[PDB]
């Protein structure tokens, strides 16, 4: 019933993501020199290094705030490359499933703890 | 005053186009397996290999017929990729300028010759 426990849980989940091969395209900002039309499609770029930095700086007040930035990584991936036959679409689907499976217990534990406070 | 002169002029202009790096995406038909939404946007596909073949077979009666097929290559390019920041948009603009500058004297020489006949 610890309202601070999510911070270190999310730190370890991001460490696991950076170790997964499927995360490689999402570890740093999309390269706008390589893809100069990216900003015509995408409003707000996002990547796992930015999420990890935002957490480390204590600029997330809750794990749901962190989830909003992660959702944007997968929203942007689909918007720029929607082809279901592409390598990046299949990498996005597997890493999204991996994130959702591990974050679910972090969110429900946090919600339980918050009721008590 | 030669009404046949345009045939060899257009053959040499196509040779110059095929040697320009900007022509690479337009040298053969768009791959409809790689771009399966292409025919949802594009009514009549066209490429420089088809134009060269049509000329060689003597199926153009005038240089204006050849010119309108080449203009369709640039109409299709802009319709499928309109982003002004894309590499293909800037390649299209430069190659189109090059073609128009060389075809103008082929058309005016032919029109002069035709008046005489």
């Amino acid at each position: 019933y610890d309202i601070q426990a999510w911070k270190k849980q999310c730190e370890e989940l991001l460490n696991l993501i950076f170790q997964c091969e499927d995360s490689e395209p999402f570890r740093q900002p999309v390269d706008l020199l390589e893809y100069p039309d990216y900003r015509d499609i995408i409003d707000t770029p996002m990547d796992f290094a930015t999420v990890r930095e935002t957490l480390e700086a204590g600029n997330y007040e809750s794990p749901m705030e962190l989830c909003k930035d992660v959702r944007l990584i997968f929203s942007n991936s689909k918007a720029y490359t929607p082809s279901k036959r592409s390598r990046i679409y299949s990498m996005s689907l597997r890493l999204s499933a991996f994130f959702e499976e591990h974050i679910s217990s972090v969110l429900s534990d946090y919600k339980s703890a918050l009721r008590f406070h | 005053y030669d009404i046949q002169a345009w045939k060899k002029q257009c053959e040499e202009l196509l040779n110059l186009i095929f040697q320009c790096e900007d022509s690479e995406p337009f040298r053969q038909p768009v791959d409809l397996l790689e771009y399966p939404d292409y025919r949802d946007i594009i009514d009549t596909p066209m490429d420089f290999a088809t134009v060269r073949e049509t000329l060689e077979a003597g199926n153009y009666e005038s240089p204006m017929e050849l010119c309108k097929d080449v203009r369709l290559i640039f109409s299709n390019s802009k319709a499928y990729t309109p982003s002004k920041r894309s590499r293909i948009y800037s390649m299209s603009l430069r190659l189109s300028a090059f073609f128009e500058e060389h075809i103008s004297s082929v058309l005016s020489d032919y029109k002069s010759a035709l008046r005489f006949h």
């Binding site: 395209p25 893809y35 039309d37 499609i41 720029y80 490359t81 929607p82 082809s83 592409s86 390598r87 990046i88 | 995406p25 771009y35 499928y80 990729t81 309109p82 982003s83 894309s86 293909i88």
Partner: peptide, 8 residues
């Protein structure tokens, strides 16, 4: 992708 844009 989005025309001759996107990643593959």
């Amino acid at each position: 992708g989005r025309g001759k844009g996107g990643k593959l």
